[PDB]
Amino acid sequence: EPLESQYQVGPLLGSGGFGSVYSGIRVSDNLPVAIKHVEKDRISDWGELPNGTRVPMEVVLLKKVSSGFSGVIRLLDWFERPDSFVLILERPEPVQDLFDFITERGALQEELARSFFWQVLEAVRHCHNCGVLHRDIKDENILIDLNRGELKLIDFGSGALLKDTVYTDFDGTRVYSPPEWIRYHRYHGRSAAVWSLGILLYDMVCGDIPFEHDEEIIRGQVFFRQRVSSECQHLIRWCLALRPSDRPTFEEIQNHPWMQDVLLPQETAEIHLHSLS
């Protein structure tokens, strides 16, 4: 029953606004896991969860998207403590987040960016279909299962239930938030999500984020610092359309020509990941 008699804690993987996550192993089968600690004082949103009670919104969101689909991390279990909650999440091995992967390898070839991007679209779409809005889509929040070549969306600590009405609260990453939020402190789930997908695609093909200051976000002028195909630039600028309604739907993004003939996960890994893995 105790958390200690359950898992064997390992080294700290990282910490921040989300909390502190450690590498871990489940004593029983040595199944690799991650142990995330979050203080109750940090937690702002709470949920009830089916036939349950007091629980952080993060847990509610995680369980809602839980399933066989490997595009989003799986909550394996959780525990409540006097001042914190502990989340036991799955952990692919080897693994590396998109931020480190790009920091190390730099701007990705378009074929690779296509595969990776396509996989987050499927993951985000999955969340939406399950009534969950992530709100913090970014390189750091996407894990790369190097052997399988499959990406995983993580950290639902900024998410919320998907809704068709306005959002007047945001606590994700500033440099990924849309111009509606910066200017009017209001946005709609899917539109905002598409904007951050635009920032992410740009990050993938250019090695860095397109905007830094609020003034750049509001103006939305995209400058390509690396050689990027015309199709890709078009998609990117379409997602980064100043007016929300001018942004493509997920269907339009995935039907976009630059998005065609995506590589399969294993293919991707064999051609791009095993080369160094």
Ligand X SMILES: CN1CCCN(c2cncc(-c3cccc(/C=C/C(=O)O)c3)n2)CC1
Residue 34 binds to ligand X (criterion: CB under 6 A): yes
Is 45 part of the annotated catalytic residue set? no
Closest contact distance (angstroms) between CB of 189 and ligand X is 20
Residue 135 binds to ligand X (criterion: CB under 6 A): no
The catalytically annotated residue of 83, 136, 139, 203 is 136
Run of H or E including 233: helix 230-239
Residue 89 binds to ligand X (criterion: CB under 6 A): yes
Q: Which is nearer to ligand X, 21 or 241 (CB)?
A: 21
Phi, psi angles (nearest 5°) of residue 141: -85, 15
Exactly one of 139, 145, 155, 180 binds ligand X (CB under 6 A); that residue is 155
Residue 136 binds to Mg ion (criterion: CB under 5 A): no
Closest CA to 181 of 169, 194, 193: 169
Closest CA to 183 of 219, 237, 221: 219
Residue 64 binds to ligand X (criterion: CB under 6 A): no
Q: Is 150 marked as binding a ligand? A: no
Residue 203 binds to ligand X (criterion: CB under 6 A): no
Distances from the Cα of 98 to the Cα of 33, 71, 106, 142, 272, angstroms: 19, 14, 10, 6, 14
Q: Which is nearer to Mg ion, 101 or 156 (CB)?
A: 156
Give Dmax (Cα) for the chain.
56
Question: What is the C-alpha to C-alpha distance for residues 138 and 196, in angstroms, rounded to an integer?
Answer: 7
**114 and 259 in contact (C-beta within 8 Å)?**
yes
- CB-count burial class (<10 Å; 0-12, 13-18, 19+) for 97: buried
Closest contact distance (angstroms) between CB of 222 and ligand X is 26
H helices within 45-188, ranges in order? 57-65, 98-105, 110-129, 179-184
Residue 14 binds to ligand X (criterion: CB under 6 A): yes
Residue 156 binds to Mg ion (criterion: CB under 5 A): yes
Q: Is 262 marked as binding a ligand? A: no
Q: Which does residue 55 bind out of ligand X, Mg ion, none, counting CB within 5 to 8 angstroms by kind?
A: none
Binding positions for ATP are 13-21, 36, 90, 97
- Interface positions with ligand X (CB under 6 A): 13-14, 18, 21, 34, 36, 73, 89, 91, 95, 97, 140-141, 143, 154-155
- Interface positions with Mg ion (CB under 5 A): 155-156
